[PDB]
Design a protein around this ligand. Sequence first.
Ligand SMILES: CN[C@@H]1CCc2c(ccc(O)c2O)[C@H]1O
Lengths: 52, 238, 331, 282
Amino acid sequence: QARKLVEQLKMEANIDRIKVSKAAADLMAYCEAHAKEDPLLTPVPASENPFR
Amino acid sequence: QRNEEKAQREANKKIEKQLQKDKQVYRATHRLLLLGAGESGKSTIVKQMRSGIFETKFQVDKVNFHMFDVGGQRDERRKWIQCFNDVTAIIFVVASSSYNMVIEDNQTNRLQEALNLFKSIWNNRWLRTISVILFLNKQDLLAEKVLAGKSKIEDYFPEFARYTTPEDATPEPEDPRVTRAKYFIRDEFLRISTASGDGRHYCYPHFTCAVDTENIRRVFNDCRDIIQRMHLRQYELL
Amino acid sequence: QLRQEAEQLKNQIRDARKACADATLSQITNNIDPVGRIQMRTRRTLRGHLAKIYAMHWGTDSRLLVSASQDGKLIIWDSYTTNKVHAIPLRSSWVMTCAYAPSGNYVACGGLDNICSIYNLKTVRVSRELAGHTGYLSCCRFLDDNQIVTSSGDTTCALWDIETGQQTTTFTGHTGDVMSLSLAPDTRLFVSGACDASAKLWDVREGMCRQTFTGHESDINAICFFPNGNAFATGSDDATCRLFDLRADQELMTYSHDNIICGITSVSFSKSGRLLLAGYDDFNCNVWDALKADRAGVLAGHDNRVSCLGVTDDGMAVATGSWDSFLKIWN
Amino acid sequence: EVWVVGMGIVMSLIVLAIVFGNVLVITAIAKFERLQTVTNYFITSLACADLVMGLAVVPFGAAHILTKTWTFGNFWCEFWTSIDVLCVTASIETLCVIAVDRYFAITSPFKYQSLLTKNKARVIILMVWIVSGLTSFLPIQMHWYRATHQEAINCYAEETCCDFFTNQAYAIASSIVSFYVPLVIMVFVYSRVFQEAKRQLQKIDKSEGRHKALKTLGIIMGTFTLCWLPFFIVNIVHVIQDNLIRKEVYILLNWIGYVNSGFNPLIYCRSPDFRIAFQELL
Ligand SMILES: CN[C@@H]1CCc2c(ccc(O)c2O)[C@H]1O
């Protein structure tokens, strides 16, 4: 049982990781780029909104 | 496009009529949850009263009771216990003759484990208004063990040493010692039950047995009392 | 014995994660302008469920959604016209999850019966009854019209094939019973969160958990990928929502409010990923600003506890289903 | 002047309180989906009856008592009398229906869920309002209630003043239907409910051995009885013998009965869910 756990942890050890700054910048850039195409972010025009 | 809307409206009306027809049945039926220690003889109660889940439907006095029992989920964590929020009552099955049987080992007592489980059920953020019907099987086995020597309650339960039989007790048509043991166990369950919550839900302790077959009537009476007390408290009389 | 080696590996993982961290997401996203207050009003309220609702799933077209309740009716709604397209009686009253196939032809649901039931809408009848889970299954999702992934209380996630009815592969090694599951936009990866406070990432093809995130303190009840697919947010009973990043292999921000201590039942993301909507046990589902972790708005329509919260694929509306048997569409 | 103005203030406060309470409870019931229930449908019917009372007969009655004359038309004073009878009968019969619903809920728990439905609640409310409307309008509008003695004829022919003069038969029947049958039904059902409550309390005391119902039923019965019983006793008495009962006492007891409409929401809407709904409303 413990052999499986230690093998899994060893497999998880050798993973390439990018700096948190780069990942945060990527998420921020995605949110900024796709901000326009969001009905929730920008209140939908009454004619445009299917529900009302 | 109007024809499609009309057809969809007709389908909606048919589904709504079927939903009302099913709502009548759903409101008619009362649901119960069977929760026990596991080795406490819950199956013997099921035989007399009547996949991981096991559902049986028994009706008494033209009232449909639907009982749900789960045994597959043996994990200590109980995340399915939060779904039984609309059940009329939770039937608790405990073997009162399991005090001497110590435990896998290292457990204090099976009765102690049942007390801990009952405390966890009672002190649940979701089952705050769900009453518990408590059944104590193996009364004959408990009597046989208590009358026989070398197995004393006080050895495993120190609180039994400074205990006396309750004055307002109704013995069956019994020995003093078995009566003291039974009422001590019932008082333990009741002290666990009453302290946490008041008025919202109550515990009904019954000294059932394997030979006894009137458990269906007892469950019916307990459910009637539960609904009466719920309605009385809703109107602020009780 | 091997416990010392496991502890040393865990310490090495923690040291590597700490060394990878240079700055927090707050330090970068504090400069950008805040989202501001957001007010959402219930456009349509869906009525007809007899008992409490656990899970829903928006259709691919965002027009239809399927809801599950304890009365046994699996109701399919037309969210635009507030009409019940179908109502499916269920063998077991107790159900914990439901799913809507991407093609819209199939609908799957499961519960405490330990059996995943798949229903064919266009032929309703049960197409296949999937068995093989010892514990209750808490979430079902569709990769394609033929492959379905179920998350069970057996502490193991499984991938099924509908045609053969047997699990193609199983995902083991996860301590607690899993309750939440989310598929990737490319469907190559998925995650599950269990009661052991650890959310793991799996690979469907390989069948091994690549990464494990253990930031939470209590049982994880909700999980959902960021729309990019490189991040996912988890909700737990610790009244905290945390955004985890796969490439950074750790959490970036935690979404907590000192005033509220109720646990989170379901989470979801907006289409752009800026808004993380998380339901709560206090009958109120909150809207968070993902980049700055500042709450934007609160939805107070529901009476009883919310259990499911989804966002349409087009991003037009958010549907929340609570225990008062009322499912409300927000926009 | 001050004495007349002093009365004007108290009737203004009474009508304002009745209207405010009734509109508040109706708005609370209608706004939230959790509050709609068969018993709450009966509460809504009671609130509607009391609101119609407060809007129609309390202000017109205050104007009549203060101005000492009826400026409006004879048809309008007849309409006012009809609306007054309708409101009183509907309110009291709705109270009786609420008592019956509680008695059925407590006495027969298993069948109560199936016995009473939304459709059955609607038809019971419709039947209660229909019988109240019959008892109010059908005798008054068809002019079957007018007395035979010339004292009533002079008042009913004149347009300046329009007071209440009633027959023996109509007064007895109206008093019976409006108050006495509901009184008997409510007393019986609440006695049974009290017996069942004390029985349940005795059972709770039997196990786990080591008041509130009395107070609740006491206030519920006392408010209604002290508000209405004297006025209906006077309704009977003034018909049986005319000398003793003066008009002022009759009108005073009528207004005391009117105040029951204002008192009703305090009694029947005193629940934590209603309190939360009121806090949300204002
Ligand atoms: C003008 N005032 C009316 C006259 C008679 C009457 C009232 C109330 C209930 C009844 O059953 C009645 O017969 C009074 O409110």
